Design a protein around this ligand. Structure first.
Ligand SMILES: [Ca+2]
Ligand SMILES: [Os+3]
Ligand SMILES: [Os+3]
Length: 341
């Protein structure tokens, strides 16, 4: 009954945010003024909740919307794709960037084309709610890095990472998470990444509705990556001991001065050394506790030994964490000879 007669833009530019939910139509509408035959404003009245007057008014006079870059915001050729079912859509944001959306009207309306520049910003560091997000060496394996933070995330928000040789481009704020690109959810102080030094860990923060709000990149340095347990963390001196004092085919692992609350655990004698656990792993870890199943802390423990075989020993601290590692090749001299059992 009322026909849209006058359409004018307010500003030449509109910039999107997270609240815009990665779709420009709501902000494009807010940037347009529509007047009818009477010169009266054409406004979405809340008394008619499931029919938007303003959008419908625009759609009745609009022949299309051209984008300057179809990869940033897709061009609208069929006008009925603009809708207000549940929410206002869709000048859908595909990628972060800046476009000139040019609105073309029908011949009847006689309204000349209106160009509105739309900026869809990339997600940034100040959009990240977790303060002090940083990389530390891993404790689950060797060559691993771990996420740490000082303060918690905002309630409802989540973190996701990507690991690559190059930084993954910052997505537009408000766009729904790229499942493919950012597939690895971060539990802070728990989750670990296998990475090489020099690689980039690209982290995005999403909201409750899986939409990109934050973005931070870390360059993985050798300092941020985990290494095997060293002789550096090994304080005790262990002397394999044989002769007539020790049982035949067994070596006495005589222990000298470990630090007050330290413990020592030996792996069973085998043809080559046992795998050195990552510095910081709990002894209670299944592979660690099964490989290094014999506690040799007392200095009085004697274990099975053959000539060529290796005995690897780990030094665990007061807390229950692996600190030191050293591998011992056994000799016939340090294998026992005393009467059996
Ligand atoms: Ca309405
Ligand atoms: Os939120
Ligand atoms: Os200690």
């Amino acid at each position: 009954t009322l026909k849209a007669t006058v359409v004018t833009k307010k500003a030449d530019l509109i910039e999107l945010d997270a609240a815009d939910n990665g779709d420009a139509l709501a902000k494009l509408l807010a940037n347009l003024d529509i007047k009818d035959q009477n010169g009266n404003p054409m406004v979405d009245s809340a008394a008619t909740p499931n029919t938007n007057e303003k959008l419908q008014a625009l759609k009745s006079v609009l022949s299309g919307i051209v984008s300057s870059d179809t990869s940033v915001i897709g061009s609208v050729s069929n006008v009925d794709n603009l809708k207000d079912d549940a929410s206002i859509s869709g000048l859908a944001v595909k990628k972060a960037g800046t476009v000139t959306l040019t609105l073309v009207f029908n011949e009847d309306s006689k309204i000349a084309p209106i160009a509105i520049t739309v900026k869809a910003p990339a997600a940034t560091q100040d959009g990240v709610t977790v303060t002090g997000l940083d990389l530390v060496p891993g404790v689950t394996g060797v060559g691993k890095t771990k996420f740490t933070a000082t303060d918690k995330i905002k309630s409802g928000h989540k973190l996701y990472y990507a690991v690559d040789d190059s930084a993954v481009p910052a997505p537009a704020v408000g766009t729904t998470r790229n499942s493919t690109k950012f597939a690895n959810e971060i539990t802070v102080g728990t989750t670990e990444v296998a990475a090489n030094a020099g690689q980039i860990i690209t982290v995005i923060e999403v909201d409750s509705s899986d939409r990109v709000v934050g973005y931070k990149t870390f360059t993985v340095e050798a300092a941020d990556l985990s290494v095997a347990a060293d002789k550096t963390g090994f304080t005790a001196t262990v002397t394999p001991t044989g002769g007539n004092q020790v049982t035949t085919g067994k070596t006495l692992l005589a222990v000298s001065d470990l630090a007050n609350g330290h413990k020592l655990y030996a792996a069973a004698a085998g043809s080559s050394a046992a795998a050195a656990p990552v510095k910081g792993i709990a002894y209670t870890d299944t592979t660690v506790r099964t490989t290094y199943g014999t506690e040799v802390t007392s200095g009085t423990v004697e274990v099975d030994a053959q000539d060529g075989q290796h005995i690897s020993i780990i030094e665990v601290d007061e807390n229950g964490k692996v600190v030191g590692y050293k591998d011992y090749t056994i000799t016939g001299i340090q294998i026992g000879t005393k009467s059996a059992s």
